[PDB]
Design a protein around this ligand. Structure first.
Ligand SMILES: C[n+]1cn([C@@H]2O[C@H](COP(=O)(O)OP(=O)(O)O)[C@@H](O)[C@H]2O)c2nc(N)[nH]c(=O)c21
Ligand SMILES: C[n+]1cn([C@@H]2O[C@H](COP(=O)(O)OP(=O)(O)O)[C@@H](O)[C@H]2O)c2nc(N)[nH]c(=O)c21
Ligand SMILES: Nc1ncnc2c1ncn2[C@@H]1O[C@H](CSCC[C@H](N)C(=O)O)[C@@H](O)[C@H]1O
Ligand SMILES: Nc1ncnc2c1ncn2[C@@H]1O[C@H](CSCC[C@H](N)C(=O)O)[C@@H](O)[C@H]1O
Lengths: 291, 291
C-alpha cells in the first residue's frame, strides 16, 4: 500500500513542490473511480469558491450567472445549501444543452437554453442591471485552438458582465500543441479533488476590487511547467494514502476534500470540524447517489 | 491680462482639481497658435516618457517600436538626443504614410511603410526577438467606433509585442457619443503642453513589471468626467499667465513645458535648471523651425 503522512494537501497550483516528466501512457489509465465523479468535482470546487465569497460578504444579494451549466445536477445541491442558510441569491444557468429537471420550479433559478456569444452577454448584462454578478464558467467546445477560443470567451464574459467574482475553467494547452502565448485573468489556481486521474484542469478564482482587471500572460514555458507539476500531482500525490488522516477514507482526494469542506458554513453546530465534514460529505454523496 | 501664481503645473489627469461644463462653441476657436505645434506636442511628451525610462535604466539596449510615426519630423530630434547621450537604441518606425526624409540613412533607424494588423505585429515580434521592446503608439483612423477600434489595436500591440514600457495615444470618447464601456491599459495619464486649444487628448504611460498586464474599465461616467476636467484645463488653466514664473515666456504651456524639460538629461552641465531648460527649449524650437 502507498502510505504517507501529510500536514495539509496542495490547495493551489503554486503549492505543488515537485514535477515529473509527463508519460503519454497515462492517457490510457482509468480516468475515474466514482460514479458521477464529475458532478462531485464541480460541486466541491464551487462550494469552496462560493463559501469564500460568503466569508467576504459578497455572495448575499448576488446573481450567479453560470455559463456552461448543463446538466447541472450538482448545482441543485449548491442552490439548496445557500438557500437553506438564508443567503439570498438568484441563479441564471445558461447552456445550449438541457438542464436536469430537478432545477425546474424554483423561483430563484432561471434556466436558459442559449449558446452565449458576446452580443447575448451584452443583453443579459443590460437585463441583470443593476444586480451584482458572480460568474462561474465551465464552457466546453479539444484542440489548443478550441481552448484559446474558450479562454477568449471567458475573458469577454468578465469584461461585459463585469462580475464581482468569478470561477473559470482553466487547463493550460499542452506544450507540444502550443499555438501562441495568451492572457488569462489573475486569480488563485484552485486544485480539484476528484478531477479525472490525469487531468491538468484547475479552476481560476478571482474577486474584482476597484474598476481594474488584471491579466497574466501564459507562455509555452508555463505550459511545460503546468504539465510537469500536474503530472507529478496526479501520478504521485493523488495516489497517496494519508495514514495520519483519521477519517473514514484516507485517500489523498478525501484528505484534499476535507480541507475544502472544512471552510463551508452549516446551520447545525458540530463538536468538531471532523464531524461537520463527515456530515457535509455524507450529505453530498447521498445527494449525488455516490455509494 | 490673465495673471496667476502657480507652484507647479498639472502634470497628470488626476491632478486636475476642477471642472467645467463643456461649451460646444469652443470647437470653433483657434486650435493652434504655433507652427508645427503638433510635432512640438509629441516631441515633449516622448522626451518626457523616454527620459523616465532612462532614469529607470530600461531604455539602453531597447528597440523603440513607434506605430503611427509618419511624418515623424520630431522623431529625428529624439533619436539625436539619446544617440548623443550614449544610449544605444534601435528605432523601428511603422506607418502606411511616408516618413520625413530626414529619418533616412541612419543605421539605428528602420522605416517601414505598412499598416499594421495583429498578424504583422506577430511577425515583427518574431523578428525583433530577443530584444526588449518599448512601444509608442500614435495611430489615427473620428467616431467613437474608430476610437474603440484604435484602442483595441493598441491593446493587441501590448499583448503581442509585450513591451517593457509603452506610451499610448489616449482621448476618451465623448459622453454624448458613448457606444460601450471598454478597457485601456493602466498607466499615468500624462497631460500634454501645446496640445490643440481644446483637446481632451493625453498620453498613457506604462511600464510593465512581471508578466502581468493590468487594464482599467472606462465608462460613460468616466467619459463625462474626462470632458469636464479637460474643458476646465483648456478653457481656464491653459489660458493663464503664470507671473511668478521668471522665464522668457510665462504662458501656462511654457510653464508646463518647463516641468517636463527639467527631467531631461544633457551632456552639458548647467548652473541652474532654468539654464538647462532654456537651452533644451531653444534647441527644440530651432530644430522644429518654430520662431
Ligand atoms: C494530461 N495530459 C493529457 N494529454 C492528452 O490529452 C488527451 C485527453 O485527455 P485530457 O487531457 O484529460 O483531456 P481534456 O484536458 O480535454 O479533459 C489525452 O489522450 C492525451 O493525449 C496530454 N498531452 C500532453 N502533451 N501533456 C499532458 O500533460 C497531457
Ligand atoms: C473637446 N471636444 C471636442 N468635441 C467635438 O470634437 C470635434 C473635433 O475636435 P477634437 O475634439 O479636437 O477632435 P479629436 O479629438 O479627433 O482630435 C469638435 O468639432 C467637437 O464637435 C467635443 N464634443 C463633446 N461632446 N465634448 C468635448 O469635450 C469635445
Ligand atoms: N457559448 C456557450 N454557451 C453556453 N454553454 C456553452 C457554450 N459553449 C459550450 N457550452 C456548454 O459548456 C458545457 C460544458 S460541460 C458543463 C458541465 C456543467 N458545468 C455541470 O454542472 O454539469 C456543455 O453543456 C456545453 O453546451
Ligand atoms: N495600422 C496602422 N499602422 C501604422 N500606422 C497607422 C495605422 N493606422 C493609422 N496609422 C497612422 O497613424 C498616423 C497618425 S498621425 C501620427 C503623427 C506622428 N506620430 C508624428 O510623429 O508625426 C498616420 O500617419 C496614419 O497612417
Amino acid at each position: 500500500m502507498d502510505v504517507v503522512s501529510l500536514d495539509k494537501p496542495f490547495m493551489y497550483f503554486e503549492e505543488i513542490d515537485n514535477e515529473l516528466d509527463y508519460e503519454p501512457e497515462s492517457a490510457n489509465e482509468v480516468a475515474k473511480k466514482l460514479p458521477y465523479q464529475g458532478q462531485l468535482k464541480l460541486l466541491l470546487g464551487e462550494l469552496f469558491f462560493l463559501s469564500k465569497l460568503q466569508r467576504h460578504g459578497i455572495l448575499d444579494g448576488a446573481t450567479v450567472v453560470y455559463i456552461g451549466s448543463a446538466p447541472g445536477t450538482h448545482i441543485r445541491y449548491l442552490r439548496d445549501h445557500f438557500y437553506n442558510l438564508g443567503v439570498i441569491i438568484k441563479w441564471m444557468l445558461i447552456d445550449g444543452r438541457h438542464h436536469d429537471p430537478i432545477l425546474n420550479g424554483l423561483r430563484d433559478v432561471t434556466l436558459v437554453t442559449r449558446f452565449v456569444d458576446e452580443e447575448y452577454l451584452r443583453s443579459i448584462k443590460k437585463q441583470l442591471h443593476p444586480s451584482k454578478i458572480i460568474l462561474i464558467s465551465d464552457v466546453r467546445s479539444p484542440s489548443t485552438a478550441d481552448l484559446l477560443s474558450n479562454y477568449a470567451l471567458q475573458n469577454v464574459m468578465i469584461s461585459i458582465l463585469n462580475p464581482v467574482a468569478s470561477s473559470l475553467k482553466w487547463r493550460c494547452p499542452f506544450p507540444d500543441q502550443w499555438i501562441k502565448d495568451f492572457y488569462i485573468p489573475h486569480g488563485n489556481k484552485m486544485l480539484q479533488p476528484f478531477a479525472p486521474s490525469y487531468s491538468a484542469e484547475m479552476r481560476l478564482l478571482s474577486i474584482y476590487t476597484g474598476e481594474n482587471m488584471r491579466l497574466t500572460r501564459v507562455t509555452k514555458s508555463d505550459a511545460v511547467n503546468y504539465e510537469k507539476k500536474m503530472y507529478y500531482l496526479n501520478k504521485i500525490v493523488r495516489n497517496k494514502v494519508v495514514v495520519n488522516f483519521d477519517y473514514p477514507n484516507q485517500e489523498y482526494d478525501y484528505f484534499h476534500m476535507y480541507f475544502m469542506l472544512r471552510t463551508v458554513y452549516c446551520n447545525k453546530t458540530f463538536p468538531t470540524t471532523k464531524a461537520k465534514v463527515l456530515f457535509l460529505q455524507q450529505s453530498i454523496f447521498r445527494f449525488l447517489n455516490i455509494p
